[PDB]
């Protein structure tokens, strides 16, 4: 019977209605992060040094877009584990606050 | 600075024991068997650990189940009870005797080495009653002995006894010498 | 409970995966076996490399039978091992970069018809000339070990694994003893 | 009443310091962090940093007093204490040389279950579906992670099985509506109960493992994510009437052990689910089948793999520089066309993606005035200046969206 029971059933209550509970927002959707993006998105050779020289977490994008001619030629990501670990850390160590945009 | 009262008392007890002169009957311990021979003796004894509560219950349940549906040889194990060991000794039934050096009541076991020597049964002193207890599924036993070793290990037991003779009985045959504890 | 199935060797070529067993314990490997291990580049513990069974190669298997285990990995197991584990000694020469760039495959081989790791997977699964070049260039995989030694539960797990290995595997020590073969898929799953 | 202290109420009691909370809980930081992760507790920013504390300006993390107080009564603390006692007893048994006793003690142990944590953290199924984004994002990455000393192979196998279950259910349900490909991997989106859940599938290349990351936190998160995914899968299968857990296909497991295995059974309403209907595809060796097979299966098509042995197919996928045979009966397609078809939701002409041709870019589917500002207040002036500075970046992005796009085309 391991996990062979519907603990949700016909549940309709909500927990986010609590005044001091912050909803579990999801990360924003992707936009033009393709493996084969428009050539205009390519970072210039001189801007690579500036991009790499910045400190961590002060960066809109944690990767350098590149032009790939085919899907099969796309190399495996070298920072997937670090990004997911940082996301997991922020999920519980990041101070959640309620703000009006 | 200050330290716990019990810690101070036990620390001072060690100094008192070291500095105090002890009679020849005392200090017969701590002249223990060497590390190698003691390790070999423990290895040999481990092969004859007595059946524990769980194993005995499992065997009895298996026998009951077999009987419910429808001639093993004599069990072999080490004898460790102090009363039982003392009853076996002086009857010329024990082959090897192990004595702990850290028995809380010293007088409880002062006579056992001398009694074994008088009876001629081989005996040895090993460091730590906890080690003896661990191999018999008990917290402490303070003593351990073998009475019926299997034929496969009879030669091993005889060789161990012969080695222990020279290692302990002959090296420490002068343990009755000048009173111990004479340390500045 | 396990059963043994004796089978006579045949001329049919076969693909086998060899894993280092690290035994017998207190044995310095002889030169006759050191040479074989160096040729198979399996000196390091837990290392595994692919080789093709043949009439000329089978006699040398007994030379290192106790030291390693053999078996026929399934296509799924080979694909998983290649796509999840793989390294190349590549120019930065001291680096052990992982197989994360299909372009590297094209550059190194080029004319062999191999342009991605998936091509290497098929070449290993389906024997061919490219296999000889790929195997040496493959830099066999350092398979992940067992419970890894220490820990309260880890010690009991290691004892249970060692007793199971000793029961399911044995060193007959006889010259005429048939080569022992096991389902390497389960071992890889345990190690992967 | 008597003279009350300067600061002993208000923020001084609503929030409790991390160290103070740990001391009050009498729980190790590791266990406290595990409980926090299970409950999802997080630090909160007080309205006044120096008022919550006794005037201290030193850095601190402020937790919610009510949350910590409620957490103190959870059974998980008792289970953790029982596990610690069992560990000490097992260590004693191992040190006593009684392996059999240790085996018996271990074989009779049972682990805690987080089923009741899910029913209180996510009282309703929609909330669980909404929060499953992170769980899927972590489980998919962990599925491809090779076994290491930090994580036993059993956990990786369980995560891979969970991911396979999710993929099989999605393909059978055909709820996929949008797809995308990125350097970090391939993004997949499904309209699960209208919640447009999105997850990222990383490339199947050997995942490099930097030892810097602490796997202990990752494993703790993965346990909860796996339990949540198991419960969600069971609920979805029960709702759809499909058998659960589905039985693995041993015969198919021998070949490639891919998404084709793990068949499911009971007991085309959308353009995405109707595309590629009745079509049969052949995937070349060099194309990733693990990525293309799922899309075709969800679309209701059929795929013949090159490894089927390791024609009638109307479509073929190959990325080779030069095709060898070029049989007229097979339509040769680049995976970019397949991705674009799902992104648009319609059968874009295949003549635009013949092998060897250029690959089109792939995009995701998702003083007159200054005069009057002299007299603005300090707050309003600062707000206006900050708004203008922020809009400067938007203007720069808008300009760059065309500047390079037009400059490069000329060359």
Curated annotation (Swiss-Prot), chain A:
Region Required for interaction with NOP7, residue ranges: 1-80
Cellular localization per UniProt: Nucleus, Nucleolus; Nucleus, Nucleoplasm
Recorded superkingdom: Eukaryota
Primary role: Component of the NOP7 complex, which is required for maturation of the 25S and 5.8S ribosomal RNAs and formation of the 60S ribosome.
Similarity-based family: Belongs to the WD repeat BOP1/ERB1 family.
Other known facts: Present with 2680 molecules/cell in log phase SD medium.
SUBUNIT field: Component of the NOP7 complex, composed of ERB1, NOP7 and YTM1. The complex is held together by ERB1, which interacts with NOP7 via its N-terminal domain and with YTM1 via a high-affinity interaction between the seven-bladed beta-propeller domains of the 2 proteins. The NOP7 complex associates with the 66S pre-ribosome. Also interacts with NOG1.
Name of the featured protein: Ribosome biogenesis protein ERB1
Lineage: Eukaryota, Fungi, Dikarya, Ascomycota, Saccharomycotina
Encoding gene (name): ERB1
UniProtKB/Swiss-Prot annotation, chain B:
GO function term, MF aspect, one: RNA binding
Gene Ontology biological process: cytoplasmic translation; maturation of LSU-rRNA
Subcellular location: Cytoplasm
Keywords associated with the record: Cytoplasm, Ribonucleoprotein, Ribosomal protein
Main location: cytoplasm
Keyword set includes Zinc-finger: no
GO cellular component terms given for this protein: cytosol; cytosolic large ribosomal subunit
UniProt keyword annotation of Aminoacyl-tRNA synthetase present: no
Remaining remarks: Present with 238000 molecules/cell in log phase SD medium. There are 2 genes for eL8 in yeast.
Subunit structure: Component of the large ribosomal subunit (LSU). Mature yeast ribosomes consist of a small (40S) and a large (60S) subunit. The 40S small subunit contains 1 molecule of ribosomal RNA (18S rRNA) and 33 different proteins (encoded by 57 genes). The large 60S subunit contains 3 rRNA molecules (25S, 5.8S and 5S rRNA) and 46 different proteins (encoded by 81 genes).
Entry's family note: Belongs to the eukaryotic ribosomal protein eL8 family.
Functional description taken from the UniProt entry: Component of the ribosome, a large ribonucleoprotein complex responsible for the synthesis of proteins in the cell. The small ribosomal subunit (SSU) binds messenger RNAs (mRNAs) and translates the encoded message by selecting cognate aminoacyl-transfer RNA (tRNA) molecules. The large subunit (LSU) contains the ribosomal catalytic site termed the peptidyl transferase center (PTC), which catalyzes the formation of peptide bonds, thereby polymerizing the amino acids delivered by tRNAs into a polypeptide chain.
Name of protein: Large ribosomal subunit protein eL8A
Gene expressing this chain: RPL8A
Residue window of the full protein shown: 50 to 238 of 256
From Swiss-Prot, chain C:
Family that this chain belongs to: Belongs to the universal ribosomal protein uL30 family.
Further details from the record: Present with 7720 molecules/cell in log phase SD medium.
Modified sites of kind Phosphoserine: 148
Protein origin, superkingdom: Eukaryota
UniProt-recorded name of the protein: Ribosome biogenesis protein RLP7
Record's keyword annotation contains Flavoprotein: no
Cell compartments where the protein resides: Nucleus, Nucleolus
GO (cellular component) term, any one: cytosolic large ribosomal subunit
GO molecular function: mRNA binding; RNA binding; rRNA primary transcript binding; structural constituent of ribosome
UniProt keywords, alphabetically: Acetylation, Nucleus, Phosphoprotein, Ribosome biogenesis, RNA-binding
Record carries keyword RNA-binding: yes
One GO biological process term: maturation of LSU-rRNA from tricistronic rRNA transcript (SSU-rRNA, 5.8S rRNA, LSU-rRNA)
Function: Involved in the biogenesis of the 60S ribosomal subunit. May act as a specificity factor that binds precursor rRNAs and tethers the enzymes that carry out the early 5' to 3' exonucleolytic reactions that generate the mature rRNAs.
Gene: RLP7
UniProtKB/Swiss-Prot annotation, chain D:
Sequence segments annotated as region (Sufficient for interaction with ERB1): 51-366
GO molecular function: large ribosomal subunit rRNA binding; mRNA binding; ribonucleoprotein complex binding; RNA binding; rRNA binding
Upregulating conditions: Expression is down-regulated prior to the diauxic shift.
InterPro entries with a match to the protein in the record: BRCT_dom, BRCT_dom_sf, PES
Main location (coarse class): nucleus
GO cellular component labels: nucleolus; nucleoplasm; nucleus; PeBoW complex; preribosome, large subunit precursor
Entry keyword set: Coiled coil, Nucleus, Phosphoprotein, Ribosome biogenesis, rRNA processing
Observed effect of gene inactivation: Essential gene. Reduced assembly of 60S ribosomes and accumulation of halfmer polyribosomes.
Protein's GO biological process: maturation of 5.8S rRNA from tricistronic rRNA transcript (SSU-rRNA, 5.8S rRNA, LSU-rRNA); maturation of LSU-rRNA from tricistronic rRNA transcript (SSU-rRNA, 5.8S rRNA, LSU-rRNA); maturation of SSU-rRNA from tricistronic rRNA transcript (SSU-rRNA, 5.8S rRNA, LSU-rRNA); ribosomal large subunit biogenesis; rRNA processing
Ranges of biased composition (kind: Basic and acidic residues): 392-401
SUPFAM superfamilies referenced in this protein's UniProt entry, alphabetically: BRCT domain
Ranges of Basic residues composition bias in the record: 379-388, 402-411
Oligomeric form and interacting partners: Component of the NOP7 complex, composed of ERB1, NOP7 and YTM1. The complex is held together by ERB1, which interacts with NOP7 via its N-terminal domain and with YTM1 via a high-affinity interaction between the seven-bladed beta-propeller domains of the 2 proteins. The NOP7 complex associates with the 66S pre-ribosome. Also interacts with NOG1. May also associate with the origin recognition complex (ORC complex).
Protein name, entry field: Pescadillo homolog
